[PDB]
Design a protein around this ligand. Structure first.
Ligand SMILES: Nc1ncnc2c1ncn2[C@@H]1O[C@H](COP(=O)(O)OP(=O)(O)O)[C@@H](O)[C@H]1O
Ligand SMILES: Nc1ncnc2c1ncn2[C@@H]1O[C@H](COP(=O)(O)OP(=O)(O)O)[C@@H](O)[C@H]1O
Ligand SMILES: Nc1ncnc2c1ncn2[C@@H]1O[C@H](COP(=O)(O)OP(=O)(O)O)[C@@H](O)[C@H]1O
Ligand SMILES: [Mg+2]
Lengths: 535, 537, 526
């Protein structure tokens, strides 16, 4: 018996074993599938362009309406260790590619649902997991058949816009489906290093301010910071700005150590007045000798230095952030100068229309940089009607900035809309008979689970799943298999090449690879050692 | 998703390991009370009652259990008393070791239905081998078989003396109650021996009363307490005043007729007491009640009247003394006849001194010459132990006289079956041979427990025990080593034929049949569902 | 009701005695052996243990599962310590040591309930163990043609079986080739601190790689790191232990000044102290700067103007690997910088693996270290991949100094049962029931290779005992086919010292459980 021996002695193995939970049985694998299918059935309704959004409420009461699969599973309070691995699966897709975070959870729940009927037939769970590796290898090699792109980043941006429209077509930015798609294309190509095929997202600043509409979202080539002119009579428009970027506060120079400067006579106190009076005239003249007409400072200003800016016609901002001035020196081509004595004409930045824009009745007055000269840093200014449509557009356009980054890493594409999943399901079924020795049932469960993603698009579009999928799959066997999928309004024919539904190759290559390995770590587990109550 | 039952469900090898520990929790208790080197226990209740016993049935009946696999072994000991009567520590150890060795088989991914079918091929072969390897019936040994079989049962209890005092009283008790039946059935009803207890002198003063020992008093202290050449009148009706029934009421319309009805309730009562006493009856036994008015007629006439005796005691007296159990008046519309020729007979009815109580004895009863045993012990705890040890000793000589066949005790049967079943598993064994091979190792726990409780050598004495039994089966040179047992006082294998260690045949045949059948039911608890207690709703 | 004294025994302590104590210790080791029973063999599952804080750890190693159970039983802690010592001595003997030591107690469990004073069992266990560890050394094969391609193939077969029963199914030919190439780049010390295993979330198991140099995680920088491009064809690395900040203060300096002409000279001197250190790094070719101490905004913008890269707040474990990769030396004082203390590489870029940036070094031929970057889909997935990588590294670490290997699976554990049953039939006494019980206890290693996937384990042991008594001595259990197979010809190899330390630790643990007769526990638990 438990907690007692046959000789009457107490039988205690581990501490607090009465409040423990242990399941080996045959339902330990069944509890992992029913916990993972409910996550996949939740994310099934938010797939495709007809996917409905979800309303997420934080612990503080903040409400965020999200549609991407990365932020939905991350903002949950799920205390289930099987469903916690589905959160890290959608997070791993966002960190690597960042487009199929919703589809990688429905695919992982589809592989576990097909493995439930295979488990009742007597197949070992590692034998299903070894059969999924031999089946996912066919889906990787078949996905690299038809793949071509003609992007040159000069004038052939038409494959780049249609690739970003597939990512933005499922979000709430379909009103700006042509305007905002061209923003994310030009924001990547101006900051990407084509010699190394590396894109840095630190150069792409994504800012948002309430007011206006979604059509007022513009791609500002430069930087957008909160302007903090210390003088209210400062000119709010500079036509040709020689920007003097400095990191020294407008003050007498204070050392970093303890000084305790001694004053003995009245000649030393009169020397204190002439020291600071000549220091504020030296820090102002050393900027005017370089020909500068705009100053950026990280730290604060003194009141004595504020009026000397207006007398010399030198506008200056105050209290700029850390990485904000790092974006100014790249957008203007200037250098960040530590002191005032190291200022020169070569370390100045070049900019055109430097002005602040007031938005309605607020007092923000953000910076707008219209003209530049070969900048490697852009800033997207997202506007909207409320904060729910702006924070989602920051998440929607970030997925559009990632699919252009994946095209520079790999210039091979596929055709989405369920066209690649039906074509990959036929490749596993053709190799299931070559040979059907042991893993015949494990490969057919992989092909039946790959058809869940295109049949979820038929369910959200108001069609029938088994009626529409049987028509599309039969047309790819009777002839050579084209880019044949589905759509919501269906655009006439079902040809994905004519409807311009273009997805990246490495996006769907990591959808099958990550969902197979996450299934292998939740099939190769036969015990749960969770505790009982909290305290 | 899962089952929505409000109780508790445990599947797999969890219950398959819990039932073995439930059976081993009972076997490890009674392992210290087996054989002549076994020791008694103490059973203390919550109210303060102390019960000192070593029998396998009295311990497990008073002990509370909760597990469903534990109630099978506790009810297995209760069946051994009715079927055999001394075989009720050995069945519990075998039936728990049958589950311990079968648990090692089902952990080797062997199906339990092959273990159940493998146990039936070994249980039926064990009864077949023990019925073809007996020594002799009760004709060659004579009275030496009944005494030596009685001393084997007493060796595990408080009456295991070196002499033959308690052994001769049991054989003389069963041989005096030989009741014949139809179609040649010499039955020996051992329940007719009234076993009485009294805290008196030592165990060597236990009287063997040839007759019956009634546990009652005379009542009125004016009757002669010793009647020689007595005539027992066994009757069952209350000798009280004539009370009318519910349907009869006394509605008098004349005041002169009042006192004649009041005297009629005692005149009809005394009319029965004068016609049962004028026929020479001196001893009157009554299961009802004799009130103080009717006790005068026995003091005046000089007769003994015993009131409020048991109904089970009146049948043992009237059958042994030739008396007729009469409940009312009878014999073809007769007023008061009583059938005086059907009175009982007795040589002497004497109330002796039983250490500050009154006990009535009947000497030889003149018709059947029955027997009753009065036990004498130090305290009441020894008298309850002496009663249980004597009742198990009466059941041993009952089965020997009925079924004239004895087997050697002290592990001699379990040693011969441990080697014959290993050769039996090799001949016709394809997939169930592992269950027959573990049936032989489970039977070896009976000589193994005799070596543990004696603090002797364990893995060498039993290894020397089966060395003689192996040569008695593979070397046909008339070695006659089938009766090799254990000498627990010396620590060497001895011959149980000359030593006088005899046990009945059905104390091991019914033990191997009940332990194998109980091991099948506990082997099929692969799934167990326990619901919540429905007490307060 | 018996003990009622005026002064008690010690305080309130309960203590068992005799034969019910010993069966209480044997049955306690059977319960803790079930947590490593289903983790044996390639068809063995893993287990997930959650603590009170909610941290989930899924693993199948015996040194990982048994340390998270929080076992407070005194006799059951003996099976946890032999799983810790197997990871400390071998690295891959873990689940097999705990389960075999529990069978040494279960085979004598019907023997300890019936007499058999345990000094005979300890003498029989030490006799059978010394004969078992000697027959392994007399049968472990070896080669005399080392330092060739044949020795590298011997190291790969021992790493594929070490990567078996892990969370790796088809990546055995990819990962175990990198494990052998990792230890051959090391020096003649085989230190585990000279190889970095860093987990990057995002990517499949095929996206992992073995860097010939080093790579750190690109920790918290300052304004000026979006400059300083990462294209270097032959850079020099300056490993430093100095602060490149303006606020470098000795925390006891009080600069008392008297006039305003000398007050400005102190502030100009504080910039001249920092700028003199940057001129020592400059004019030496050291384009890459690495320091474990932070660098402020001044020295970050100085290197961006001079087209130099820097990296501050580097961990000390990464700078020790960086020193052995480039072949330089970490200089705390910048005044002694020369060409003999700077590093040299070929390719130094900052990639975007898994979203986070990583500054990797590559191209140095005199690399005494390496870095194995893991890419997975979960944090617990890469922790199991790191734990499976340490088992394959510690097998191939011990295989270089001792190349004597044996057959894998239950091939050695079955033939040791043959040599011990033949030895038990040649000695008289009570040792026939103990040496033979020690031989039957070794047959559970081919049982757990079959009980985890069915395989009809009763019939497959009759084929193993018949093949070892007739022909070869390396026949074991095949995993793909449900039959017996020669594990030496099927390249299922393992080093001989894996099973030597397994039989030694399991016997000394089993001799400790049978030697304790009393267990006294004091009630003071605060
Ligand atoms: N015009 C279209 N026609 C058909 N299918 C489409 C169209 N646009 C998008 N889809 C489908 O909608 C799905 C949206 O997936 P999504 O939720 O964005 O993945 P992730 O969560 O990884 O970003 C894609 O798999 C794609 O096949
Ligand atoms: N003189 C003796 N020598 C050896 N063994 C004996 C002797 N007397 C009794 N035994 C053994 O002691 C055991 C007592 O069993 P017991 O507990 O009476 O069974 P039950 O509980 O069914 O009555 C018997 O099985 C018998 O073999
Ligand atoms: N290809 C294979 N075929 C058969 N058996 C294998 C194979 N690979 C590994 N095994 C078995 O799996 C077992 C894994 O043991 P393991 O848990 O690694 O021990 P430890 O915990 O000491 O590292 C080994 O004993 C080995 O016999
Ligand atoms: Mg999308």
């Amino acid at each position: 018996t438990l907690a007692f021996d046959e000789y009457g002695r107490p039988f205690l193995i581990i501490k607090d074993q009465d409040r423990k939970s242990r399941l080996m049985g045959l339902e330990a694998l069944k509890s992992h599938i029913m916990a993972a299918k409910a996550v996949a059935n939740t994310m099934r309704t938010s797939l495709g362009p007809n996917g409905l959004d979800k309303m997420m409420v934080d612990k503080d009461g903040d409400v965020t309406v999200t549609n991407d699969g990365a932020t939905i599973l991350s903002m949950m309070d799920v205390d289930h260790q099987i469903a916690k691995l589905m959160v890290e699966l959608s997070k791993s897709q966002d960190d690597e590619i960042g487009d199929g975070t919703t589809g990688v959870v429905v695919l992982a729940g589809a592989l576990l649902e097909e493995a439930e009927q295979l488990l009742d037939r007597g197949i070992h769970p590692i034998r299903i997991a070894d059969g999924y590796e031999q089946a996912a290898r066919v889906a990787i090699e078949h996905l690299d058949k038809i793949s071509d792109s003609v992007l040159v980043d000069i004038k052939d941006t038409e494959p780049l816009i249609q690739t970003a429209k597939t990512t933005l077509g499922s979000k709430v930015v379909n009103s700006c489906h042509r305007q905002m798609a061209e923003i994310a294309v030009n924001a990547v190509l101006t900051v990407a290093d084509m010699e190394r095929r590396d894109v840095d997202f630190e150069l792409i600043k994504v800012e948002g301010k309430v007011g206006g509409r979604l059509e007022d979202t513009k791609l500002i080539k430069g930087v957008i910071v909160d302007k903090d002119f210390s003088h209210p009579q400062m000119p709010k428009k500079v036509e040709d700005a020689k920007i003097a970027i400095l990191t020294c506060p407008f003050e007498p120079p204070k050392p970093k150590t303890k000084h305790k400067l001694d004053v003995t006579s009245v000649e030393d106190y009169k020397a204190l007045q002439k020291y600071e009076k000549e220091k504020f005239e030296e820090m102002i003249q050393q900027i005017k000798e370089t020909g500068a007409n705009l100053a950026i400072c990280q730290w604060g200003f003194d009141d004595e230095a504020n009026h000397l800016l207006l007398q010399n016609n030198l506008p200056a901002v105050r209290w700029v952030g850390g990485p904000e001035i790092e974006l100014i020196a790249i957008a203007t081509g200037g250098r960040i100068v530590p002191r005032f004595s190291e200022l020169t004409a070569e370390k100045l930045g070049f900019a055109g229309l430097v002005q602040e824009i007031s938005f309605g009745t607020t007092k923000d007055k953000m910076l707008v940089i219209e003209q530049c000269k070969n900048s490697r840093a852009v800033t997207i200014f997202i506007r909207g009607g409320n904060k729910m449509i702006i924070e989602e557009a920051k998440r929607s356009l970030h997925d559009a900035l990632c699919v252009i980054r994946n095209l520079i890493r790999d210039n091979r594409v596929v055709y989405g809309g369920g066209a690649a999943e039906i074509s990959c399901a036929l490749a596993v079924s053709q190799e299931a008979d070559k040979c059907p020795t042991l893993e015949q049932y494990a490969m057919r469960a992989f092909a039946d689970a790959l058809e869940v993603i295109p049949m979820a698009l038929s369910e959200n579009s108001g069609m029938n799943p088994i009626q529409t999928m049987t028509e599309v799959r039969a047309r790819q066997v009777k002839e050579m298999n084209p880019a044949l999928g589905i759509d919501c309004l269906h655009k006439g024919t079902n040809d994905m090449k004519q409807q311009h539904v273009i997805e990246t190759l490495i996006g769907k290559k990591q959808q099958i690879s990550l969902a197979t390995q996450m299934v292998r770590m939740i099939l190769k587990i036969d015990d749960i050692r969770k505790p009982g109550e909290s305290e | 998703g899962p089952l929505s039952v409000f109780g508790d469900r445990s599947t797999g090898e969890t219950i398959r390991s819990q039932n073995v520990m439930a059976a081993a929790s009972i076997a490890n208790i009674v392992k210290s009370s087996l054989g002549p080197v076994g020791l008694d226990k103490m059973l203390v209740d919550d109210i303060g009652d102390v019960t000192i016993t070593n029998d396998g049935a009295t311990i497990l009946k008073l002990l509370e259990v909760e597990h469903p696999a534990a109630k099978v072994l506790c009810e297995l000991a209760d069946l051994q008393d009715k079927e055999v009567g001394d075989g009720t520590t050995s069945v519990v150890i075998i039936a728990a070791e049958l589950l311990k060795n079968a648990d090692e088989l089902v952990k080797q991914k062997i199906h339990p239905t092959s273990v159940i079918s493998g146990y039936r091929l070994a249980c039926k072969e064990a009864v077949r081998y023990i019925n073809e390897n007996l020594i002799v019936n009760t004709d060659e040994l004579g009275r030496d078989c009944l005494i030596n079989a009685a001393k084997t049962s007493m060796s595990s209890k408080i009456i295991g003396i070196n002499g033959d005092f308690f052994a001769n009283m049991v054989v003389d008790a069963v041989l005096a109650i030989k009741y014949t039946d139809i179609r040649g059935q010499p039955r020996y009803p051992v329940n007719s021996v009234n076993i009485l207890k009294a805290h008196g002198r030592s165990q060597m003063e236990s009287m063997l009363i040839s007759g019956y020992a009634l546990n009652c008093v005379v009542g009125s202290q004016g009757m002669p307490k010793r009647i020689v050449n007595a005539k027992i009148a066994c009757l069952d009706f209350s000798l009280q005043k004539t009370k009318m029934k519910l349907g009869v009421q006394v509605v008098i319309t004349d005041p002169e007729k009042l006192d004649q009805i009041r005297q009629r309730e005692s005149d009809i009562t005394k009319e029965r007491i004068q016609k049962i006493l004028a026929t020479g009856a001196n001893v009157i036994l009554t299961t009802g009640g004799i009130d103080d008015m009717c006790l005068k007629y026995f003091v005046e006439a000089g007769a003994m009247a015993v009131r409020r005796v048991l109904k089970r005691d009146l049948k043992r007296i009237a059958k042994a003394s030739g008396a007729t159990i009469l409940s009312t008046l009878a014999n073809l519309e007769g007023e008061e006849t009583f059938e005086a020729a059907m009175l009982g007979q007795a040589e002497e009815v004497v109330q002796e001194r039983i250490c500050d109580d009154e006990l009535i004895l009947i000497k030889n009863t003149k018709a059947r010459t029955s027997a009753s045993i009065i036990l004498r012990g130090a305290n009441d705890f020894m008298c309850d132990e002496m009663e249980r040890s004597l009742h198990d000793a009466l059941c041993v000589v009952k089965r020997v006289l009925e079924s004239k066949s004895v087997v050697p005790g002290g592990g001699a049967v379990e040693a011969a079956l441990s080697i014959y079943l290993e050769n039996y598993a090799t001949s016709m064994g394809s997939r169930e041979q592992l269950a027959i091979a573990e049936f032989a190792r489970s039977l070896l726990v009976i000589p193994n427990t005799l070596a543990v409780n004696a603090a002797q050598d364990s893995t060498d004495l039993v290894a020397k025990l089966r060395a003689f039994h192996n040569e008695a089966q593979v070397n046909p040179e008339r070695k006659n080593l089938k009766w090799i047992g254990l000498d627990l006082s010396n620590g060497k294998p001895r011959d149980n034929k000359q030593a006088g260690v005899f046990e009945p045949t059905i104390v091991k045949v019914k033990s191997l049949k009940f332990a194998t059948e109980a091991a099948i039911t506990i082997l099929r608890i692969d799934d167990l569902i326990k619901l919540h207690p429905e007490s307060k709703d | 009701m018996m003990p009622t004294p005026v002064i008690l025994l010690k305080e309130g302590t309960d203590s068992s005695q005799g034969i019910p104590q010993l069966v209480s210790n044997i049955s306690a080791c059977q319960v803790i052996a079930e947590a490593v029973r289903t983790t044996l063999g390639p068809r063995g599952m893993d287990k997930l243990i959650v603590d009170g804080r909610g941290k989930a750890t899924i693993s199948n190693d015996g040194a990982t599962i048994l340390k998270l159970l929080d076992v407070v039983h005194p006799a059951a802690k003996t099976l946890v310590d032999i799983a810790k010592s197997q990871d400390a001595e071998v690295g891959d003997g873990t689940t097999s040591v705990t389960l075999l030591a529990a069978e040494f107690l279960k085979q004598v469990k019907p023997y300890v309930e019936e007499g058999l004073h345990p000094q005979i069992i300890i003498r029989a266990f030490r006799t059978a163990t010394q004969l078992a560890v000697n027959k392994i050394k007399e049968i472990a094969v070896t080669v005399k043609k080392a330092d060739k391609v044949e020795q590298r193939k011997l190291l790969e077969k021992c790493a594929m079986t070490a990567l078996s029963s892990k969370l790796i199914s088809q990546q055995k030919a990819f990962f175990a080739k990198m494990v052998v190439d990792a230890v051959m780049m090391l020096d003649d010390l085989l230190q585990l601190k000279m190889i970095g295993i860093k987990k990057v979330q995002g990517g499949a198991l095929e996206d992992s790689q073995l860097v010939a140099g080093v790579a750190f995680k690109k920790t918290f920088s300052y304004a000026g790191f979006e400059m300083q491009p990462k294209k270097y064809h032959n850079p020099k690395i300056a490993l430093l232990n100095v602060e490149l900040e303006l606020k470098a203060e000795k925390d006891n300096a009080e600069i008392r000044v008297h006039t305003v002409e000398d007050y400005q000279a102190i502030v100009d001197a504080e910039w001249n102290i920092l700028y003199d250190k940057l001129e020592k790094i400059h004019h030496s070719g050291a384009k890459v700067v690495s320091s474990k101490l932070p660098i402020g905004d001044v020295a970050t913008q100085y290197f961006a103007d001079r087209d130099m890269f820097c990296a501050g707040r580097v961990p000390e474990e990464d700078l020790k690997r960086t020193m052995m990769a480039c072949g330089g030396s970490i200089q705390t004082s910048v005044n002694a910088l020369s060409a003999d203390v700077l590093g040299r590489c070929q390719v130094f870029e900052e990639t975007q693996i898994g979203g986070e940036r990583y500054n990797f070094f590559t191209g140095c031929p005199k690399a005494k270290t390496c870095t194995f970057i893991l890419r997975g889909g979960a944090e617990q997935f890469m922790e199991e991949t790191e734990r499976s990588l340490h088992d394959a590294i510690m097998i191939v670490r011990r295989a270089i100094k001792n190349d004597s290997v044996v057959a894998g699976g239950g091939a050695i554990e079955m033939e040791l049962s043959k040599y011990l049953r033949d030895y038990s039939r040649t000695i008289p006494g009570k040792q026939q029931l103990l040496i033979g019980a020690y031989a039957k206890a070794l047959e559970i290693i081919p049982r757990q290779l079959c009980d985890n996937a069915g395989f009809d384990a009763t019939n497959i042991l009759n084929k193993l005992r018949a093949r070892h008594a007739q022909g070869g001595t390396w026949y074991g259990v095949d995993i793909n086919n449900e039959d017996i197979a020669d594990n030496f010809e099927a390249f299922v190899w393992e080093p001989a010292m894996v099973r030597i330390n397994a039989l030694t630790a399991a016997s000394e643990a089993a001799c400790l459980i049978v030697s304790v007769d009393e267990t006294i526990k004091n009630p003071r638990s605060t």
